[PDB]
RNA sequence: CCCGGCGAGGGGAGUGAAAAAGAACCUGAAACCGUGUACGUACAAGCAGUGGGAGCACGCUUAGGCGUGUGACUGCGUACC
RNA sequence: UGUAACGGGGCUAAACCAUGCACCGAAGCUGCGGCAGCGACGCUUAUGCGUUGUUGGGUAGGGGAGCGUUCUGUAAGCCUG
């Protein structure tokens, strides 16, 4: 419902959302840089 | 009859009853306009004065067009840099029509 | 005032017909359908059948007088097409388009 | 600002002719250029010409001073593949006298389509051939 | 869930295609060149606002040079004499008396010929 | 071979405008009846240019 | 009932709030060409646009002095990922 | 391959060398309209006004913060033949 209640702010980051273009910070590599398994599937290196 | 007057950095020539472009009036359409900033006046001989403005000289006018023009968009980009920039602009206009020239 | 005649789904593409339907435009009420007494190709018969309907059926379908009757519009458009395939070795497909047209004629008392 | 428009009610053509008889080709070209461009008068001129109409009537009697009369040559690529012709002033004016004025003045005019819109209004004659006799040209002597 | 993209991707096409029509061929509606009729057109409009600020400035110089040369002096020397004479100048757009009042402009070039030593 | 999109109607009509050269000659009246006929061709009465050609 | 080959497919009267609601029947935009009409288009070399504009057409309006649509022609101009 | 080793003309000075004063010369300098940030000086603490000073093209990556879209709740409401 919420409606008549005052909301709370600054207690969630807003958020996991990924960059859509470099005018908003990050673009075509999403902050992981270019190529290698380190850019596709986790940290890209074993134990 | 014609006159020449000052407004800041720019100097304007105008004739009796004529319309002329001015810089934006803050009072819009709501008041009449007058100038004592007149620095040359002629009706049959085009005499120049070197002294600062005509003593007791007056130009009177009415506002005939005022407002903020059509909205436009212009854009900036760079070759293979994958961003896009956009500026909005409108600009203000003001035109005034002479009602008197007095000396 | 106005009378309409049509023929839909005709066995011709519209460009076979339109050459003649464009030629007969801009002619006097003494020359219209009198320039179409002797005709060239099936293309011209498809117009003749519909024009001889419009310029004569208004005598029952609009009013008793047709003795100053004029053609206001005389045009043709390409209708729905039917897709068909033909034999080629190591098939693979090879098609043709079986075309149709829609003929329109309009006449007016003014 | 805007206060003038070139059209036949504001720019009347009145027809002038430069006397070429014994005139120096270069001094004649510096006059013909500015008078085909419209530049001798109080005018306003955009990407157009504000002319008066000007022609040449006795071109086969034009002169060159000192040397370059029988020395140096003018070149043209004929348009028949790599074909080229060359002639000196006193042996070129003997054959093609109306070309001598064209090749002398064309480089004193603007480039491209504006330079072409000026050049299309120029006609050159030899033997005193009076072919604008109804336009009654006013003579200029330099 | 599926993105219908009518309010977004298609709107981002229409925002450009709206500025089409009125052209001498394909750019009136062919999207992949009607885009160039906004983007390349804007690089031409920046050049219009630059050239009407750089190259049309010469109309305040070259027109006045020819008129001063009828009095036998060139612009580069005429202006230095008119600086030495004091007053009657502010902005180069105000010099069109070289066409509108050639008698009073002649006296102003002659003033520079009485101050250039 | 190459052809970009579609031929312009401004050039296609300019190539149709000499393709058949179809003209109006209003036809000539028959030499035995009050009605018009096709040049050097038989009439509906089986006649041509003042003489009988076929039986009815 | 009118037209034609007792066609093909329309139309007139008529059913209906609707027949762009007709069995080929919800509402309906695009590519593609099509009917009318206004201005434009007749020698002139490259991303067909950007700016300027003679001429023409449309609608108001006249003490300090029209705008719109359309536009020969010309200054400027080698796309996108 | 054809104007073709100033791009080309003009030019026996209009070339070559250096000299003296002028002028033309960016999106910047500089003036103004507007905005965000940093900080003073004058007046005042809805919190602003006045003036002066100053920074603002930013990609791999590191931080800050809006507008739409859809579902769920509001919705026993609000708009609607």
XYZ file of C-alpha atoms (C1' of nucleotides) in Angstrom:
737
model
C 0.000 0.000 0.000
C 2.309 2.804 1.362
C 0.211 5.835 0.040
C 0.034 8.168 3.182
C 3.414 6.968 4.689
C 6.721 8.957 4.408
C 9.329 6.823 2.438
C 12.950 6.119 3.591
C 15.983 6.919 1.321
C 19.855 6.489 1.399
C 19.569 2.932 2.884
C 19.641 1.138 -0.551
C 22.266 1.844 -3.300
C 19.989 1.918 -6.432
C 21.747 -0.420 -7.351
C 22.877 -3.573 -9.284
C 21.733 -1.929 -12.628
C 24.443 -2.061 -15.358
C 25.693 1.003 -17.339
C 23.933 1.653 -20.729
C 26.378 4.312 -22.078
C 29.494 6.299 -21.028
C 27.527 9.578 -20.404
C 26.194 7.750 -17.258
C 29.561 6.012 -16.533
C 30.542 2.629 -18.104
C 29.447 1.370 -21.583
C 30.124 -1.639 -23.920
C 32.363 -3.618 -21.415
C 30.266 -2.988 -18.208
C 33.370 -2.171 -16.025
C 35.125 -5.561 -16.759
C 37.401 -4.222 -19.588
C 38.010 -5.979 -22.945
C 38.020 -9.796 -23.511
C 39.407 -12.863 -21.650
C 37.366 -15.233 -19.390
C 37.781 -12.532 -16.644
C 35.234 -10.455 -18.685
C 32.706 -13.314 -19.428
C 32.440 -15.810 -16.494
C 33.366 -14.702 -12.934
C 36.962 -13.669 -12.024
C 38.131 -16.017 -14.890
C 40.949 -17.785 -12.855
C 41.167 -21.028 -10.781
C 42.259 -21.672 -7.135
C 13.221 63.181 -38.761
C 15.635 60.443 -37.560
C 17.778 59.761 -34.446
C 20.714 57.581 -33.230
C 20.771 56.142 -29.653
C 22.806 53.857 -27.317
C 22.081 50.576 -25.455
C 25.197 49.078 -23.768
C 27.812 47.885 -26.316
C 25.501 48.647 -29.371
C 24.382 51.837 -31.212
C 21.049 52.033 -33.178
C 19.753 54.348 -35.982
C 15.914 54.793 -36.129
C 13.382 57.057 -37.971
C 10.062 58.671 -36.908
C 7.234 56.081 -36.362
C 9.698 53.194 -37.224
C 10.004 49.665 -35.649
C 13.469 48.455 -34.387
C 15.066 45.388 -32.665
C 16.086 45.880 -29.007
C 17.604 43.619 -26.291
C 15.053 41.699 -24.102
C 12.874 43.985 -21.918
C 12.399 42.579 -18.364
C 8.926 44.318 -18.120
C 7.653 42.549 -21.323
C 4.535 44.294 -22.840
C 3.439 45.891 -19.493
C 4.998 49.422 -19.915
C 5.892 52.116 -22.496
C 9.581 52.790 -23.352
C 11.608 56.044 -23.433
C 15.319 56.913 -24.021
C 17.466 59.968 -23.156
C 20.534 57.965 -24.467
C 20.219 59.844 -27.870
C 23.584 60.920 -29.423
C 22.587 62.266 -32.928
C 19.376 63.896 -34.396
C 18.562 65.126 -37.962
C 15.558 66.542 -39.910
C 17.225 68.385 -42.900
C 21.018 68.576 -42.085
C 22.921 65.627 -40.557
C 25.009 67.489 -37.896
C 27.232 65.476 -35.474
C 27.849 66.259 -31.770
C 31.117 65.325 -29.957
C 29.616 66.240 -26.503
C 28.003 63.358 -24.464
C 24.302 62.987 -25.557
C 21.674 65.568 -26.657
C 20.814 67.855 -23.702
C 17.088 67.406 -22.819
C 16.634 65.068 -25.890
C 13.936 62.305 -25.700
C 12.875 59.283 -27.828
C 9.486 57.619 -26.967
C 8.344 54.102 -28.039
C 5.811 51.237 -27.509
C 6.553 47.452 -27.358
C 5.112 45.739 -30.494
C 6.580 42.203 -30.173
C 8.069 40.380 -27.128
C 8.606 36.756 -26.014
C 10.609 33.500 -26.273
C 10.972 31.886 -29.748
C 10.682 28.310 -31.109
C 12.519 25.471 -29.297
C 15.408 23.778 -31.221
C 17.806 20.799 -30.745
C 21.504 20.594 -31.793
C 23.785 17.542 -31.215
C 27.486 16.637 -30.657
C 29.393 13.333 -31.084
C 32.934 12.001 -31.871
C 34.074 9.394 -34.476
C 34.027 5.841 -32.935
C 33.615 7.100 -29.273
C 29.999 5.818 -28.861
C 28.462 8.816 -26.938
C 25.804 11.422 -27.969
C 25.257 14.980 -26.584
C 22.172 17.207 -27.044
C 21.590 20.959 -26.417
C 18.162 22.626 -26.178
C 17.902 26.355 -27.122
C 14.997 28.915 -27.437
C 16.292 32.595 -27.326
C 14.255 35.756 -26.393
C 13.045 38.488 -28.847
C 11.949 42.177 -28.475
C 10.881 44.784 -31.104
C 9.790 48.407 -30.282
C 7.973 51.091 -32.395
C 8.664 54.866 -32.152
C 5.869 57.134 -30.766
C 7.966 60.381 -30.487
C 11.355 62.086 -31.160
C 11.754 65.418 -29.237
C 14.552 68.047 -28.819
C -25.730 12.181 -59.155
C -22.817 9.668 -59.221
C -22.663 5.981 -60.400
C -19.877 3.405 -59.737
C -18.945 0.137 -61.522
C -16.146 -2.351 -60.583
C -14.586 -5.691 -61.537
C -12.459 -7.332 -58.767
C -9.925 -10.239 -58.999
C -9.596 -10.035 -62.849
C -7.163 -12.413 -64.752
C -4.645 -9.653 -65.651
C -1.968 -7.586 -63.900
C -2.950 -3.899 -63.709
C -0.097 -2.550 -65.943
C -1.479 -4.552 -68.956
C -4.783 -2.595 -68.447
C -3.512 0.828 -67.178
C -1.883 1.778 -70.543
C -5.409 1.954 -72.115
C -7.124 3.305 -68.943
C -4.629 6.286 -69.018
C -4.996 6.819 -72.847
C -8.825 7.300 -72.764
C -8.577 10.116 -70.108
C -8.861 13.805 -71.174
C -11.321 13.095 -74.107
C -14.706 14.730 -75.005
C -18.166 13.213 -74.180
C -18.423 12.732 -78.012
C -15.173 10.590 -77.979
C -15.332 8.602 -74.659
C -16.365 4.899 -75.322
C -16.427 5.844 -79.109
C -12.559 5.469 -79.086
C -13.185 1.995 -77.461
C -15.543 0.405 -80.116
C -12.656 -1.622 -81.632
C -10.191 -2.751 -78.885
C -6.616 -4.146 -78.541
C -5.830 -7.116 -76.153
C -7.884 -8.653 -73.253
C -6.631 -5.592 -71.281
C -9.055 -3.256 -73.162
C -12.066 -5.698 -72.905
C -11.708 -5.701 -69.071
C -12.301 -1.877 -69.185
C -14.987 -2.000 -71.968
C -17.258 -4.437 -69.974
C -17.195 -2.137 -66.851
C -17.443 1.202 -68.774
C -20.459 -0.117 -70.792
C -21.992 -0.983 -67.359
C -21.390 2.431 -65.662
C -22.469 4.640 -68.642
C -25.772 2.680 -69.170
C -26.856 1.250 -65.742
C -27.265 4.797 -64.218
C -30.596 4.943 -66.209
C -32.022 2.578 -63.485
C -29.297 3.065 -60.795
C -29.351 6.928 -60.538
C -32.190 8.546 -62.593
C -34.099 8.519 -65.926
C -31.707 10.915 -67.835
C -28.193 9.770 -69.021
C -27.995 11.929 -72.230
C -25.065 14.174 -70.976
C -23.270 11.504 -68.798
C -19.478 12.055 -68.168
C -16.701 9.748 -66.769
C -15.084 11.303 -63.632
C -12.564 8.509 -62.748
C -11.291 5.498 -64.778
C -8.497 3.528 -63.050
C -7.031 0.064 -62.240
C -5.013 -1.369 -59.295
C -3.017 -4.624 -58.750
C -5.007 -7.155 -56.678
C -3.901 -10.048 -54.394
C -1.239 -12.372 -55.913
C -1.064 -16.198 -55.627
C 2.354 -17.913 -55.005
C 3.192 -21.126 -57.027
C 6.389 -23.316 -57.316
C 7.923 -24.948 -60.470
C 10.179 -28.065 -61.009
C 14.021 -27.717 -60.666
C 16.523 -30.573 -60.017
C 18.052 -31.144 -56.493
C 15.116 -29.163 -54.975
C 15.495 -26.369 -53.565
C 12.519 -24.115 -54.517
C 11.637 -21.889 -57.546
C 8.405 -19.738 -57.625
C 6.169 -17.501 -59.782
C 3.459 -14.920 -58.800
C -0.028 -15.427 -60.416
C -1.340 -11.791 -60.439
C -4.851 -10.215 -60.458
C -6.327 -6.664 -60.836
C -9.240 -4.504 -59.625
C -10.900 -2.253 -62.281
C -12.876 0.901 -61.173
C -15.124 3.286 -63.243
C -17.073 6.362 -61.958
C -19.629 8.531 -63.881
C -21.504 11.765 -62.931
C -24.632 13.741 -63.900
C -22.413 16.886 -63.273
C 20.886 43.122 -42.435
C 18.744 43.189 -45.644
C 17.947 46.349 -47.716
C 18.578 45.384 -51.427
C 17.599 42.665 -53.982
C 19.138 42.282 -57.500
C 16.373 41.811 -60.139
C 15.764 43.605 -63.548
C 13.737 46.520 -61.961
C 16.676 47.328 -59.540
C 19.587 46.398 -61.920
C 19.059 47.692 -65.516
C 21.365 46.415 -68.278
C 22.446 49.289 -70.535
C 25.196 47.672 -72.735
C 28.853 48.809 -72.811
C 31.787 47.952 -75.158
C 35.553 48.256 -74.509
C 37.499 49.478 -77.561
C 40.159 46.753 -78.127
C 41.874 48.515 -81.122
C 45.609 48.733 -80.140
C 44.737 48.089 -76.395
C 47.107 46.017 -74.194
C 45.550 42.543 -73.563
C 46.279 42.551 -69.758
C 45.044 46.164 -69.083
C 41.951 45.318 -71.217
C 41.351 42.127 -69.136
C 41.640 43.986 -65.748
C 38.868 46.367 -66.993
C 36.648 43.669 -68.601
C 36.884 41.510 -65.425
C 35.678 44.214 -62.953
C 32.959 45.422 -65.434
C 31.672 41.818 -65.946
C 31.752 41.376 -62.077
C 29.989 44.813 -61.595
C 32.854 46.355 -59.464
C 33.167 50.115 -60.242
C 30.068 51.540 -58.447
C 28.085 51.779 -55.179
C 26.553 48.216 -55.094
C 25.405 45.362 -52.792
C 26.305 41.932 -54.362
C 25.664 38.402 -52.851
C 26.416 35.104 -54.799
C 25.091 36.799 -58.011
C 26.275 39.410 -60.586
C 25.140 43.100 -60.502
C 26.228 43.842 -64.127
C 25.292 46.336 -66.908
C 26.048 43.990 -69.921
C 29.550 44.244 -71.520
C 31.048 42.911 -74.837
C 34.189 43.159 -77.112
C 33.858 44.136 -80.839
C 37.366 44.425 -82.491
C 39.245 41.569 -80.699
C 41.529 40.718 -83.711
C 43.141 44.224 -83.254
C 44.163 43.719 -79.530
C 47.905 44.166 -78.703
C 50.764 42.733 -76.550
C 53.669 45.062 -75.531
C 57.440 44.425 -75.872
C 58.038 40.627 -75.927
C 55.570 37.615 -75.614
C 54.250 38.434 -79.170
C 56.296 35.706 -81.003
C 57.698 34.002 -77.826
C 55.700 31.877 -75.300
C 52.684 29.683 -76.151
C 49.105 28.938 -75.023
C 48.120 25.243 -74.555
C 44.787 23.395 -74.994
C 43.841 19.672 -74.587
C 41.523 19.057 -77.576
C 39.311 16.285 -76.045
C 40.526 13.724 -78.679
C 42.167 11.397 -76.089
C 45.674 12.823 -75.073
C 45.615 15.331 -78.044
C 47.136 18.817 -77.347
C 47.654 22.056 -79.381
C 50.061 24.985 -78.774
C 50.494 28.427 -80.477
C 52.197 31.846 -79.843
C 50.137 35.103 -79.496
C 50.771 36.562 -83.022
C 50.031 33.150 -84.750
C 47.044 32.272 -82.445
C 45.215 35.652 -82.912
C 45.624 35.073 -86.697
C 43.407 31.898 -86.389
C 41.177 32.103 -83.214
C 40.989 35.870 -82.282
C 37.877 35.483 -80.033
C 39.613 32.823 -77.791
C 42.421 35.309 -76.873
C 40.008 37.464 -74.775
C 38.456 34.375 -73.044
C 41.818 32.890 -71.871
C 43.030 36.377 -70.739
C 39.962 37.310 -68.547
C 38.697 33.906 -67.135
C 41.367 33.897 -64.300
C 40.231 37.455 -63.203
C 36.692 36.088 -62.430
C 35.490 33.831 -59.514
C 35.622 29.977 -59.690
C 32.960 27.436 -60.686
C 29.189 28.171 -61.247
C 29.306 31.885 -60.174
C 32.335 32.421 -62.505
C 30.310 30.575 -65.241
C 27.157 32.730 -64.632
C 29.377 35.788 -65.390
C 31.129 34.162 -68.432
C 27.792 33.157 -70.154
C 26.930 36.924 -70.435
C 30.202 37.718 -72.339
C 30.415 37.730 -76.185
C 33.581 38.526 -78.198
C 33.745 39.639 -81.869
C 36.393 40.304 -84.558
C 36.279 42.255 -87.879
C 34.001 44.862 -86.116
C 31.015 42.405 -86.548
C 28.100 44.477 -85.072
C 25.670 41.744 -83.883
C 24.158 43.652 -80.870
C 23.171 46.649 -83.093
C 19.734 47.021 -81.341
C 21.396 47.131 -77.846
C 23.416 50.289 -78.917
C 26.672 49.667 -76.877
C 28.321 52.660 -75.076
C 32.118 52.824 -75.866
C 34.789 52.753 -73.099
C 38.379 53.875 -73.960
C 41.168 52.883 -71.445
C 8.871 -10.636 -20.010
C 9.127 -8.932 -23.463
C 9.980 -5.287 -24.278
C 7.383 -3.979 -26.815
C 9.796 -1.071 -27.753
C 7.066 1.104 -29.409
C 7.516 3.840 -26.732
C 11.390 3.488 -26.830
C 13.285 2.061 -29.923
C 10.484 2.982 -32.425
C 10.092 6.416 -30.754
C 13.922 6.944 -31.161
C 13.412 6.204 -34.924
C 10.336 8.543 -35.233
C 12.118 11.452 -33.389
C 14.515 11.474 -36.427
C 12.045 10.407 -39.218
C 9.772 13.401 -38.237
C 12.579 15.714 -39.536
C 12.518 13.999 -43.007
C 10.140 14.854 -45.989
C 10.576 17.881 -48.352
C 13.657 16.330 -50.151
C 14.770 15.659 -53.786
C 14.724 11.820 -53.393
C 15.169 9.001 -50.814
C 15.821 11.224 -47.691
C 12.085 12.178 -47.598
C 11.419 8.739 -45.913
C 14.303 6.159 -46.320
C 15.378 5.966 -42.634
C 19.119 5.010 -43.011
C 19.684 8.230 -45.109
C 16.939 10.394 -43.476
C 19.129 9.928 -40.341
C 22.002 11.501 -42.381
C 19.542 14.351 -43.321
C 19.568 15.217 -39.538
C 23.131 14.190 -38.436
C 25.160 15.441 -41.507
C 22.697 18.361 -41.817
C 23.651 19.394 -38.216
C 27.407 19.289 -39.128
C 26.454 21.576 -42.102
C 24.338 23.865 -39.808
C 27.309 24.257 -37.394
C 29.369 25.245 -40.513
C 26.538 27.705 -41.541
C 26.694 29.437 -38.080
C 30.564 29.379 -38.214
C 30.940 30.707 -41.822
C 28.258 33.447 -41.302
C 30.473 34.498 -38.280
C 33.983 34.110 -39.948
C 33.801 34.611 -43.754
C 30.862 37.094 -43.997
C 32.954 39.422 -41.670
C 34.876 40.268 -44.905
C 31.777 42.263 -46.096
C 32.713 44.846 -43.384
C 36.311 45.010 -44.840
C 36.486 44.299 -48.629
C 33.453 46.522 -49.592
C 35.012 49.430 -47.617
C 38.522 48.765 -49.071
C 37.198 49.265 -52.658
C 35.388 52.508 -51.635
C 38.546 53.916 -49.891
C 40.597 52.924 -53.015
C 38.360 55.361 -55.048
C 39.988 58.068 -52.807
C 43.479 56.508 -53.490
C 44.133 54.685 -50.113
C 44.009 50.965 -49.086
C 42.147 49.597 -45.978
C 45.339 48.650 -44.008
C 46.586 52.314 -44.158
C 43.139 54.025 -44.080
C 42.287 52.417 -40.683
C 45.689 53.407 -39.131
C 45.090 57.052 -40.257
C 41.484 56.940 -38.878
C 42.843 55.614 -35.493
C 45.299 58.607 -35.402
C 42.382 61.008 -36.196
C 40.251 59.832 -33.141
C 36.409 59.258 -32.931
C 33.822 58.240 -35.663
C 34.449 54.433 -35.141
C 33.144 51.587 -32.879
C 32.122 48.430 -34.879
C 32.963 47.446 -38.495
C 29.234 46.792 -39.329
C 28.650 50.619 -38.991
C 30.841 51.494 -42.091
C 28.109 51.002 -44.827
C 28.106 54.810 -45.460
C 30.682 53.637 -48.111
C 27.499 52.849 -50.227
C 24.692 54.807 -48.434
C 26.538 58.194 -47.980
C 29.610 58.192 -50.305
C 30.124 62.012 -49.838
C 30.386 61.728 -46.003
C 32.475 58.512 -46.317
C 34.820 60.393 -48.754
C 35.319 63.064 -46.020
C 36.102 60.253 -43.453
C 38.769 58.678 -45.767
C 40.124 62.219 -46.419
C 40.297 62.694 -42.577
C 42.598 59.619 -42.430
C 44.717 61.202 -45.279
C 45.055 64.321 -42.980
C 46.195 62.214 -39.919
C 48.500 59.586 -41.610
C 52.055 61.080 -41.473
C 24.747 -7.596 -61.963
C 23.432 -4.900 -59.543
C 20.275 -2.709 -59.258
C 19.718 -0.433 -56.181
C 16.230 -0.825 -54.540
C 13.595 0.036 -57.253
C 13.686 2.044 -60.549
C 12.395 5.613 -60.036
C 8.936 6.229 -61.581
C 10.385 9.469 -63.078
C 12.708 7.267 -65.266
C 10.407 4.196 -65.660
C 7.543 6.333 -67.069
C 10.183 8.078 -69.267
C 10.960 4.487 -70.635
C 7.189 3.609 -71.002
C 6.418 6.855 -72.957
C 7.804 5.334 -76.251
C 6.932 1.602 -75.656
C 3.736 1.381 -77.830
C 3.129 4.963 -79.255
C -0.698 4.418 -79.095
C -2.678 7.141 -80.972
C -6.313 8.312 -81.553
C -7.400 8.555 -85.247
C -11.188 8.662 -84.431
C -11.722 5.957 -87.172
C -13.282 6.518 -90.639
C -16.972 6.039 -91.628
C -17.762 2.852 -93.619
C -18.377 3.334 -97.390
C -21.816 1.528 -97.178
C -23.181 2.498 -93.670
C -23.717 5.415 -91.171
C -21.129 3.945 -88.666
C -17.281 3.844 -88.290
C -14.937 0.937 -89.153
C -11.303 -0.250 -88.740
C -8.844 0.680 -91.575
C -8.594 -2.064 -94.291
C -10.768 -4.424 -92.095
C -14.219 -6.018 -92.715
C -17.463 -4.607 -91.157
C -20.155 -6.444 -89.096
C -22.345 -6.620 -92.278
C -19.509 -8.677 -93.938
C -18.622 -5.687 -96.234
C -15.500 -3.614 -97.098
C -14.937 -0.350 -99.124
C -18.198 -0.588 -101.206
C -18.339 -4.454 -101.772
C -19.448 -7.718 -100.067
C -16.635 -9.919 -98.604
C -18.503 -12.693 -96.620
C -22.014 -14.223 -96.436
C -24.433 -13.720 -93.462
C -34.405 -4.771 -61.016
C -30.007 -2.431 -64.097
C -24.856 -4.163 -66.807
C -22.778 -8.901 -69.224
C -21.619 -14.500 -72.074
C -28.885 -16.957 -67.441
C -20.793 -14.537 -66.997
C -17.071 -12.347 -63.970
C -17.839 -8.516 -60.267
C -20.324 -4.211 -59.176
C -24.669 -0.955 -58.574
C -30.169 0.507 -57.682
C -34.199 -0.612 -54.255
C -33.693 -3.000 -49.567
C -31.831 -5.561 -44.083
C -28.885 -2.445 -40.343
C -26.715 2.101 -35.384
C -22.569 0.248 -38.867
C -22.188 -3.343 -44.994
C -14.376 -0.210 -44.272
C -19.813 -4.303 -39.691
C -21.349 -8.628 -46.486
C -19.171 -15.343 -44.815
C -13.092 -12.596 -49.257
C -17.599 -9.948 -41.939
C -13.815 -7.272 -35.232
C -10.146 -2.180 -35.109
C -6.043 -1.011 -38.196
C -0.599 1.796 -39.118
C 3.847 0.613 -42.834
C 6.723 -1.112 -47.325
C 4.737 -1.166 -52.771
C 1.690 1.978 -56.852
C -2.428 4.566 -57.346
C -6.796 9.054 -58.403
C -7.061 14.399 -58.417
C -4.602 19.272 -57.947
C -1.053 23.462 -56.600
C 4.026 25.302 -56.955
C 8.515 23.142 -59.338
C 11.217 20.657 -63.182
C 14.628 21.433 -70.618
C 22.195 20.917 -71.374
C 25.711 19.980 -67.447
C 29.915 15.785 -64.027
C 30.652 13.099 -57.324
C 26.736 10.782 -49.943
C 21.448 14.271 -53.506
C 21.874 17.452 -48.111
C 22.993 22.689 -45.659
C 22.391 27.954 -46.136
C 21.061 32.045 -49.468
C 17.119 33.423 -53.636
C 15.077 35.777 -58.895
C 10.026 33.844 -60.309
C 5.024 31.849 -59.074
C 0.724 30.538 -55.965
C -2.234 31.219 -51.199
C -4.379 34.403 -46.968
C -4.326 38.940 -44.128
C -3.082 44.307 -44.102
C -1.836 49.696 -45.224
C 1.559 56.793 -41.024
C 7.187 54.823 -41.414
C 6.540 50.142 -44.446
C 3.566 41.291 -44.505
C 3.714 36.294 -43.673
C 3.087 31.284 -45.503
C 3.679 27.370 -49.319
C 6.749 26.470 -53.608
C 11.277 27.491 -56.147
C 14.985 27.962 -61.500
C 19.867 29.184 -59.539
C 24.065 29.567 -56.435
C 27.927 29.916 -51.774
C 28.957 25.398 -48.639
C 29.577 19.854 -48.709
C 33.575 12.569 -50.155
C 28.078 8.512 -45.706
C 27.307 4.646 -41.318
C 28.872 0.372 -38.083
C 48.248 7.168 -70.464
C 47.157 13.374 -71.163
C 47.523 19.923 -69.164
C 51.233 16.793 -65.027
C 58.828 17.721 -60.514
C 54.739 26.091 -58.081
C 48.073 23.290 -58.837
C 47.810 27.087 -62.580
C 48.111 32.070 -64.736
C 50.390 36.914 -64.329
C 55.209 38.704 -64.034
C 62.832 40.563 -66.889
C 60.862 42.063 -61.366
C 55.576 41.141 -60.289
C 61.584 36.413 -58.896
C 65.842 36.341 -54.937
C 67.724 38.159 -50.098
C 66.551 41.367 -45.196
C 64.522 45.674 -43.604
C 60.754 49.475 -41.587
C 55.924 50.505 -40.265
C 50.936 49.086 -40.820
C 46.676 45.600 -41.603
C 44.151 40.379 -41.985
C 44.399 36.240 -38.855
C 40.741 30.105 -33.903
C 35.390 27.084 -31.223
C 40.337 30.250 -27.661
C 41.605 35.927 -25.678
C 37.803 39.452 -24.908
C 32.099 41.547 -24.118
C 27.242 39.880 -23.012
C 22.826 36.051 -21.929
C 22.329 31.493 -19.187
C 23.867 27.079 -15.778
C 26.540 24.099 -12.130
C 30.820 23.950 -8.643
C 34.643 26.251 -5.608
C 35.868 30.894 -2.525
C 35.877 36.275 -0.955
C 34.166 41.569 -0.357
C 29.155 44.886 0.761
C 23.910 44.467 2.657
C 20.621 40.777 4.715
C 19.404 35.441 7.380
C 11.747 33.327 3.580
C 17.355 33.044 2.855
C 18.285 36.084 -0.910
C 20.148 40.379 -3.391
C 24.807 43.279 -5.181
C 29.961 42.932 -6.921
C 34.564 40.615 -7.753
C 37.465 36.094 -8.583
C 37.648 31.096 -10.840
C 36.862 25.914 -13.109
C 33.884 23.443 -16.504
C 36.129 18.679 -24.705
C 37.244 14.079 -21.668
C 38.309 6.878 -22.849
C 39.707 1.490 -20.198
C 38.131 2.187 -15.163
C 36.351 4.621 -10.163
C 31.915 7.633 -7.838
C 26.988 10.737 -7.805
C 21.836 11.083 -9.587
C 16.815 11.462 -12.979
C 12.838 10.202 -16.811
C 9.983 6.513 -18.895
C 8.395 0.640 -19.161
C 5.890 -3.694 -16.528
C 4.016 -6.258 -12.520
C 2.162 -6.039 -7.346
C -0.335 -2.747 -3.698
C -3.077 1.854 -3.291
C -7.912 0.929 -6.688
C -14.585 -0.486 -2.205
C -10.721 5.119 -5.384
C -10.176 8.572 -10.111
C -11.244 9.057 -15.839
C -14.912 6.169 -19.447
C -20.297 4.435 -24.273
